[PDB]
């Protein structure tokens, strides 16, 4: 079966942190406010997302064709940001976190606590995507190059924090022990 743009995209190397935003959410023309402007190619980028055969997609050169893909990518990214915030998308992200699709904290003293994806700002092209570890409560850079390049605004500074109170039980308790700065078994005497 031909995998729709949504389902296929998620399987690309590094771009797996994206849940399948329901078709029911894209066809809901109400959420598309703002995006209708700031994002270029809007109709031909949304036609590609729903995999509908474009009335002028045939008529594009190699040069126009590649750019529609990149516009649909920026679009679906900002689409994903609003979907993960709704009560519907919140459920869908939870499942990827259950199967540790959003990695595990690089800080050793955080044991192996899985993380949440988040962009440095809800503003496009301004920042790459980062992660948030709930145990230490701080933010880090991704573990792979393919993940560490993607724009972060496609998640925003709202989702990891929303996930926190949505699922209060998942909020882990702080680090059991503390880092011991030891040189030859002797702590660093700081006055």
């Amino acid at each position: 079966e031909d995998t729709s743009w949504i389902s296929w995209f998620c399987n690309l190397r590094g771009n797996e942190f994206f849940c399948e935003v329901d078709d029911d959410y894209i066809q809901d023309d109400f959420n598309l406010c703002g995006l209708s402007s700031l994002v270029p190619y809007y109709e031909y980028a949304l036609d590609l997302i729903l995999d509908v055969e474009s009335s002028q997609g045939e008529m594009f050169t190699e040069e126009q064709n590649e750019l529609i893909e990149s516009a649909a990518e920026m679009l679906y990214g900002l689409i994903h940001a609003r979907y993960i915030l709704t009560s519907k998308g919140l459920a869908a992200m939870l499942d990827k976190y259950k199967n540790y699709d959003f990695g595990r904290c690089p800080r050793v003293y955080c044991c192996g606590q899985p993380c949440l994806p988040v962009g440095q700002s809800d503003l496009p092209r301004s920042s790459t995507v980062k992660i948030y570890c709930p145990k230490c409560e701080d933010i880090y850079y991704p573990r792979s190059k393919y993940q560490g390049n993607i724009d972060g605004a496609y998640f925003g500074t709202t989702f990891p924090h929303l996930f926190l109170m949505t699922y209060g039980h998942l909020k882990p308790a702080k680090a059991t022990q503390n880092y011991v700065q030891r040189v030859f078994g002797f702590k660093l005497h700081k006055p």
Partner: protein
């Protein structure tokens, strides 16, 4: 069609009162309010419980989801014009995230129990009291030239412990301008008036009275929703099976409206059913003869024949509530 009351409110008042599209958006300090937890999961805006960082007084934070800038200004302008009003939710501030300009409305703290969980435990007196308190809010906003247009259980917040009622979410509210034709895609399905279902666009404040009647019927008869349509067409069919089709034809003929033949085939022909039909031993304690007369005077096809909020407050059904309010203010003047 023109409203029976408060007709020229927005013609009398200056352009600045009702011209929400030209409202100046004076944002406050988003840093002054700290979020605590989610509460309502509405898809037009998300609701949270918060606190003012300085006073530490609790508050409600309503974050608006991307809509037309004029829709945001409409709700704010209406909230500003009604601010302070009796049983109207009080808007305290309007702030936005400094980088994404995502707007949030700051209201007084609700602390209510939702209507669905609470009403099965209410006495007939408590129903009259709360309906009366809701009518006070409706008369106020109507007197200020505003229609709520989304009257429903979720938008009526009650803290039964403190006997406080607030009419919330003015996102669908609009200014009444005499003779103006409005969009009919308002109110929740079960509470849509016949005017919305038959495309009578020059409706008025009386639309809220139909919605109130639907809520009232659902309460006293313990049937939620009272008119349970699976879609917009079926909603009118459900209404016609209770009110009758002869009265519907008279209403259609009065306002020179005609239904699409497919819809008229669905409605068919039905007699008027007396409100007594819906009484049962489980709801008897809530259905008095005054309750029936009051409900009958709200659920009328003809919007101009429905009681106004002021007329409704004066009904014999609320005699006890009005007497208790008069006795409360006498025993409180002495203490």
């Amino acid at each position: 069609s023109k409203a029976r009351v408060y007709t020229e409110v927005n013609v009398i008042r200056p352009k600045d009162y009702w011209d929400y599209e030209s409202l100046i958006v004076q944002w406050g300090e988003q840093d002054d309010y700290e979020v605590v937890r989610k509460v309502g999961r509405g898809k037009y805006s998300e609701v949270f419980e918060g606190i003012n960082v300085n006073s530490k007084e609790k508050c409600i934070i309503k974050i608006l989801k991307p809509v037309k800038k004029k829709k945001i200004r409409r709700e704010i302008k209406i909230l500003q014009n009604l601010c302070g009003g009796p049983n109207i939710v009080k808007l305290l501030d309007v702030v936005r995230d400094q980088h994404s300009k995502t707007p949030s409305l700051i209201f007084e703290y609700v602390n209510s129990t939702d209507f669905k969980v609470l009403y099965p435990t209410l006495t007939d007196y408590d129903i009259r009291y709360y309906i009366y308190e809701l009518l006070k809010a409706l008369d106020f906003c109507h007197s200020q030239g505003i229609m709520h247009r989304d009257v429903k259980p979720h938008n009526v917040m009650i803290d039964h412990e403190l006997r406080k009622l607030r009419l919330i979410d003015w996102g669908l509210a609009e200014f009444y301008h005499p003779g103006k034709e409005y969009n009919v895609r308002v109110a929740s399905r079960y509470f849509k008036g016949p005017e919305l279902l038959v495309d009578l666009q020059d409706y008025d404040y009386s639309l809220d009275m139909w919605s109130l009647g639907c809520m009232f019927a659902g309460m006293i008869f313990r049937k939620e929703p009272f008119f349970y349509g699976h879609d917009n067409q079926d909603q009118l069919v459900k209404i016609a099976k209770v009110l009758g089709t002869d009265e519907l034809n008279a209403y259609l003929n009065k306002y020179q409206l005609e239904l699409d033949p497919q819809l008229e085939a669905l409605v068919g022909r039905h007699s008027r059913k007396p409100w007594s039909k819906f009484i049962n031993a489980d709801n008897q304690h809530l259905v008095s003869p005054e309750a029936i007369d009051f409900l009958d005077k709200l659920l009328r096809y003809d919007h101009q024949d429905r009681l106004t909020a002021k007329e409704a407050m004066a009904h014999a059904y609320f005699a006890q509530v009005r007497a208790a309010e008069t006795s409360r203010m006498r025993s409180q003047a002495a203490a």
